[PDB]
Amino acid sequence: TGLIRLQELIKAPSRYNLRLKIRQLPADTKDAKPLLKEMKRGKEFHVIF
């Protein structure tokens, strides 16, 4: 449902030059460690939670 909650933020690359990469949390609460590892692999430093 969160993609419903962020419709304007999703559509905002049409308005501006912003590039957006969208990732989903796993169903397990403690399984954020591989996903956060991609944060250290893609060098992505501006994260919206």
Binding site: T1, I4, Q7, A27
Partner: protein
């Protein structure tokens, strides 16, 4: 018979669906896009 939004925390188990699951349909669309080898795509959606 129509796809509905499935709440992930729902634990009902007395239903079946016959519309194809949109996870598999989106996987097929992604495979078609990778086969045609695009770089800049546009997704136009009607309902949220």
């Amino acid at each position: 018979t129509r796809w509905k939004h499935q709440v992930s925390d729902n634990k009902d188990s007395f239903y079946v669906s016959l519309y194809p699951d949109f996870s598999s349909l989106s996987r097929a669309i992604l495979d078609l896009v990778q086969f045609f080898k695009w770089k800049t795509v546009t997704v136009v959606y009607d309902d949220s």
